[PDB]
Amino acid sequence: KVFGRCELAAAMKRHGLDNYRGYSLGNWVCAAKFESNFNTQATNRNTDGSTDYGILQINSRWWCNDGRTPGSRNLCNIPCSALLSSDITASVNCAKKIVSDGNGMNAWVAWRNRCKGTDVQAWIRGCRL
Ligand code: NA
Numbered sequence: 001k002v003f004g005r006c007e008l009a010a011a012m013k014r015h016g017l018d019n020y021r022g023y024s025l026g027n028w029v030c031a032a033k034f035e036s037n038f039n040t041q042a043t044n045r046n047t048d049g050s051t052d053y054g055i056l057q058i059n060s061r062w063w064c065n066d067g068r069t070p071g072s073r074n075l076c077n078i079p080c081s082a083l084l085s086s087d088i089t090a091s092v093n094c095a096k097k098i099v100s101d102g103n104g105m106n107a108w109v110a111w112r113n114r115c116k117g118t119d120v121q122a123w124i125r126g127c128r129l
Contacts, residue, residue: 001086003038005029006127008055008088013129015092021099025129026120027111028095032056033123034110040091041084054083054091056098056108063094 003011009029012018018025035057036042044052050061050069058076060069066080076094083091098107105111115123 001040003032003040003055005033005038005123006129008032008038009124009127010129011088012092015088017092017095018129020096021104023099023105024120026123027105027115028056029123030115030118030120031105031108031111034114035108040086040088043084051080053080054085055088056091056095057110058083058091058094058098063098 009025012028013025017028032038032055036055038055040055042054042057044057046052046059046061048061050059051066052059053064053066058064060066060072060080062073063076064078064080064083065072065074076097078090078094083094099105
């Protein structure tokens with residue numbers, strides 16, 4: 001499922017991401033835009049034989065089982081395909097354990113490179129929230 005900016009903003013707020021670990025909604029929308037283009041089905045092979053899955057491009061090295069990621073961890077205790085659903089519950093709940101682990105949203109390269117230190121409130125501007 002491909003979300004619009006404000007449609008995902010509202011879905012993410014609905015799932016309790018707004019100021020989760022002090023990260024305002026704009027931060028999550030910005031990350032989602034530059035990670036997946038708001039597409040729950042987005043997959044991208046990483047450098048090391050891992051793959052990134054879903055709206056927040058969660059990585060198989062650490063966070064889920066895709067049955068091809070070397071000597072792998074499943075820290076969110078899901079198959080990576082669960083993250084591609086039109087229902088974003090799995091991606092949101094896993095993202096909460098990622099951002100909580102101590103590095104915050106720096107886990108997302110797109111966030112660190114494109115959202116961090118920018119006017120992230122632009123991302124929810126004109127959105128019914
Ligand atoms: Na894995």
